[PDB]
Design a protein around this nucleic acid. Sequence first.
DNA 1: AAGCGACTCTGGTGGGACTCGAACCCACAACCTTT
Lengths: 579, 689
Amino acid sequence: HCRGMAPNGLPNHIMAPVWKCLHLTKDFREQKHSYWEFAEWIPLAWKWHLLSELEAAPYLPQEEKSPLFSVQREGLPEDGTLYRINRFSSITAHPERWDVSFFTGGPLWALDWCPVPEGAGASQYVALFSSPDMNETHPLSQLHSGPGLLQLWGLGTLQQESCPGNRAHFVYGIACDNGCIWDLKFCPSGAWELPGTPRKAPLLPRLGLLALACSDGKVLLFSLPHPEALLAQQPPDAVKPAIYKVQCVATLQVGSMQATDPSECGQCLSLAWMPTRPHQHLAAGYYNGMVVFWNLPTNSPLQRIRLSDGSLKLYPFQCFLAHDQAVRTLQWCKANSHFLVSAGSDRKIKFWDLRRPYEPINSIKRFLSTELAWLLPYNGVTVAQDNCYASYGLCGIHYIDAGYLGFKAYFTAPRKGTVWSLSGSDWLGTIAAGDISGELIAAILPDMALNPINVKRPVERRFPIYKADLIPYRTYTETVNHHYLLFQDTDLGSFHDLLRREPMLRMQEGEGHSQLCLDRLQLEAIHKVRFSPNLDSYGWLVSGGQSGLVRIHFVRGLASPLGHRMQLESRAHFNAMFQ
Amino acid sequence: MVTRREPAVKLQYAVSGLEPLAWSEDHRVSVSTARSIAVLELICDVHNPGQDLVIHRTSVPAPLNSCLLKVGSKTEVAECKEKFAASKDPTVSQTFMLDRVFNPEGKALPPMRGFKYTSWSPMGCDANGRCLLAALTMDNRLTIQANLNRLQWVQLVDLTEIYGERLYETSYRLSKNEAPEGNLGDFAEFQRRHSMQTPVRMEWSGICTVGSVLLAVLFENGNIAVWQFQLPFVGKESISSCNTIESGITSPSVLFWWEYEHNNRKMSGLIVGSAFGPIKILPVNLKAVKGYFTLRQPVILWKEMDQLPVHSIKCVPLYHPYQKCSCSLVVAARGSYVFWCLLLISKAGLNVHNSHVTGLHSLPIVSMTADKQNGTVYTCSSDGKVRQLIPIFTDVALKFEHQLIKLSDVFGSVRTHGIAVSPCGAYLAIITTEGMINGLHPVNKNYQVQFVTLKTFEEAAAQLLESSVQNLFKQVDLIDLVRWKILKDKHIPQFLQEALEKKIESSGVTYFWRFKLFLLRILYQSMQKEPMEEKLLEIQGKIEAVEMHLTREHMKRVLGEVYLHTWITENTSIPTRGLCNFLMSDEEYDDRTARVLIGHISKKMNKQTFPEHCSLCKEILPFTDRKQAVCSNGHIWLRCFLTYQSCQSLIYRRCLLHDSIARHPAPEDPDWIKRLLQSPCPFCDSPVF
DNA sequence: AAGCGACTCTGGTGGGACTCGAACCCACAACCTTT
Ligand SMILES: [Zn+2]
Ligand SMILES: [Zn+2]
């Protein structure tokens, strides 16, 4: 045990797992990430055709200006101005708290951070998809294949010297003729290289390698160039929202080399890259209940074919029927990649041994799980849920042991609404979660090697990050013409006096007593959350939803001297290696 | 060609494991299930008119106790588990805590006592005539099961127990100095000691010749234990040896016995498929039978390491018509493809051809079976799609032609979890489940075994007349097609009746009389089991005419044995004088050869009577009748149909079809009738039990 | 004093099983019902 109060104001026994997770994550990545993979798949500029303004217009998301909003920050004076920002534009970072809002033109339904090797100090980016129309909603049972756009947004390097006055820049987007995109996953490591890498003019230094899960039922694999390499290769007079039409590295789909009989699988609803070097496998969850895997380096004429355009088509090496219903979420075990967890809309969480797919290691039946997280150090999984089957007020966020330790599920956070999305920061050992109530919270897990029933009270381990509130001022236009979004942001500088501060009381009044909202759009709803996977910026968080606004937050209170030292150690090593 | 047979067998529990449907050589169907093996026995019921498949249902219950593998002393293993669970490293701790091989039963973990795999032996392995069932639980308990009485399956042995003892007494080293004794506190050695005894899959050889049979059990590390069983198998006493060979294949996935015959030279080996693609045949060198012999050198069938798992392997012998010789077709389900290889020994040595037949399914193959008589392969996927896949000979090797089977046209929207052809390819059994209802998921999931025809009655009749085996039990699935037709249409179709009379007129072997007897008995059922009463009485007379014939020909066999063997008072186990009088009794029987046989016997017979006594009376039984004996003062005993001694025992061997009866052999019986008592009954082939 | 980890302790609800309340069904005697 450990005693006293941490300098951020949390108890030392609450912080001690957070500090422990830093070392465990660093050692894991040293062992099982890498600095380069897929050397064959470097971006080629001649496959990046820039669409003209009149060619791009069908792909652009349709809202040209955000809803009107205002942001209140705990302990600052009330600004009182309503902000509004154009599609593909951003407000300036708050000079002291560095949060940023930017507008993507439609409701955000996929989002991921571009991974960067620790110590690189690079420019940070997010890839995201925002649906074209605020009012569209798509039936799961049917393939879509409409036009859409994948957006890459640059956040800068996010150093303390850089953050004041920062802005997000729309660096480019890809015109996608494959319907809406339900999941985005970058290759976890080895895809990035230095932007200054010397490569001949056709070859552009690789920013990353990205898998798209399409409602058209196929996975698209893009290797991404660094933006500076495109803009130097692009003619300077071109229109600045650079929308490219891009040939994939590969299209990943379910089939066989001569079976034209179209797959039952329907929409592709979830992705997971293999968490460990060399990341050679990619898994996807499908509407028909299958989990599918492709062996991306495969030479075999039974799995690889080259299309006339020169891109590959890949057919899977293995599939198995994981669920009786849509496989709404996957997580792949970091600590040993023979294990994967998948949850389905039959509301079972199933743990799998990928050597022995005929029987899950464990099924635990639960409420209707919307997203999983599997943090590196803990044997169990954290589950966000849809509330439709939970008892009133017993819905929320649960952590669920995979079962050897035998602990009861830990009710980490009560929620009224469905949590749409969740992510675990391996660096922090914490989760953040976003609600149809438009509240974003974070919660710190206990050290889950030790029985959670002795956790005296979970409430002291969780806090709000923001809540959006609609203020009057169902169609989207019928809402925005009559309401504005009041984003209320907490002081994340520290957790001193936490439970007596206004946002905690507001959150605790939200828990239990507050009521669901219907007969309006739910323009308030949050749809995605991602903690930063990178050690540089490890304390940063991004989220967005039905507003099509996207917000970047820095949880300054969990960024702490061990991580700041560990950053500087990794900074010095990287600069000593790569020059 | 394909229509459903009207029974659907509803299953109580979720279907479980690998290739979960099997149809045995003995026409019993087993479904490996999460709480039992459901065992379904096809009866060609001659005593009732119900046109359904008469399926008798029995089951093997799951074990009550979880099978912890022995990896060390009972204290040291617990110390090691505690160590790895406590390990501060995320990798070691979760690798231990997630692999159920180390945690077969736990606190919140669900038990894994349901069945992973099942593999029937060939016929003849049991203490009866029947085949045994090898059954592998998901917690790695490997057992051999038998149904000695009809009601209750019994575990004859546990092979996971025995192998753990064998390994423990050799410190888990197979070659005595192959390595130092590893520290069990090393997770690598702990994992190894588990891996080297975690069974993947298992298959029986043919019978080897006292008969013997081999069971190969394939472990996660690529070891194979070849068990050799003495026959008839009765328990641990019958385990003649265990010998372990090392395949060296990384991640073994599937196993089969290659067995080959050309130029009167037997050869055999094991074909092993990896989880990563490759397929290879291993020389099984460690064996002690003289009749079988082993492959000269390993032969690699597929080397590519493409990471398509070899989910299934089957092998079928084919007479190649252009190469004009015995050849062997290997087919393997690998991903959504069937790898095939045709192996053909020629004057040029072993000639090997291989390919992938391609474009079969848009999903991985979930199950495969081959018609052993023709090499027609059936393959299946969770689409509910089944595809017939026909080998067509080519001047060398084969081409495959294929066509979809329209299961949705007979079952509606369905998922198919497994298929199995019947031994003669008369039926395809198929596990089915409710499918996607126009893209909607089915709200509730129920498993059924369902059956569709694959042959018409007219092809079944042709195959029964030109039968190679000339054996009604081996062909009892084709027989059930003939039964179904005759019950449905209440007459014997003219071409079959005329053709059978021609076979009886020309060949006349007792198979064709047994076949005629079957048709007549089903016909008698069909007409409601007045002219109809006259018709019933007529064919009841015709049944008796052929039923008496099959008796008299068997009586002649019994007298034949009694004459050829030593005429000694050990004859008392046979009512020889009763049979002599009976078999010559009437000029209704013509056979001069029987009468001269009785002449030679009656010349050699003693004048001493040695009459059979009713035990409750110690009064004589006169041998009046075929079926049964009666004494004065009112007692009745069923007679045997193998020997003709009366069943006065409290236990006697009733035919599977109850058409017939026999004694258990006593130690007082000589060998030459201990042989005879093992015959199938004269009225049908079936195990008399 | 100040605190940790068991061990009860006070309340709220769901799962499957099961009571619940209704109409529907038999066959008869009562007699209304008809040339
Ligand atoms: Zn008597
Ligand atoms: Zn019989």
